[PDB]
Design a protein around this ligand. Structure first.
Ligand SMILES: *[C@@H]1O[C@H](CO)[C@@H](O)[C@H](O)[C@H]1NC(C)=O
Lengths: 49, 48
């Protein structure tokens, strides 16, 4: 019923009512780089990639 | 008595990839109790 990898995570499954397959992928997570000046009121934002 | 010109190549490493690591996304990505517990064991994240 379930699909696993070498690390034990779940990367897929199969529905019981409809008998169809799916894939599981992790969602986005990251930081943001801010360039700030000495006496500035708001820094500049850069979302890399 | 007779000569020629020979060529060779040489490589020297001068740089390396710049790796950046943070505490949140590595230890306490999406957990609040994890953050509350990490805020008591000393940061060490400023040092890293
Ligand atoms: C030296 O070698 C080159 C290339 O093989 C040739 O053209 C030339 O005549 C040679 N010189 C002598 C003095 O043998």
């Amino acid at each position: 019923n379930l699909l696993y990898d070498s690390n034990g995570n779940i990367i897929g499954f199969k529905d019981f009512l409809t008998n169809k397959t799916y894939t599981i992928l992790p969602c986005y997570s990251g930081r943001v780089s801010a360039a700030f000046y000495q006496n500035s009121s708001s820094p500049a934002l850069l979302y890399r990639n | 008595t007779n000569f020629t010109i020979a060529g060779h190549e040489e490589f020297i490493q001068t740089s390396s990839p710049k790796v950046t690591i943070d505490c949140s996304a590595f230890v306490c990505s999406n957990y609040a109790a994890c953050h509350d517990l990490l805020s008591e064991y000393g940061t060490f994240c400023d040092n890293i």
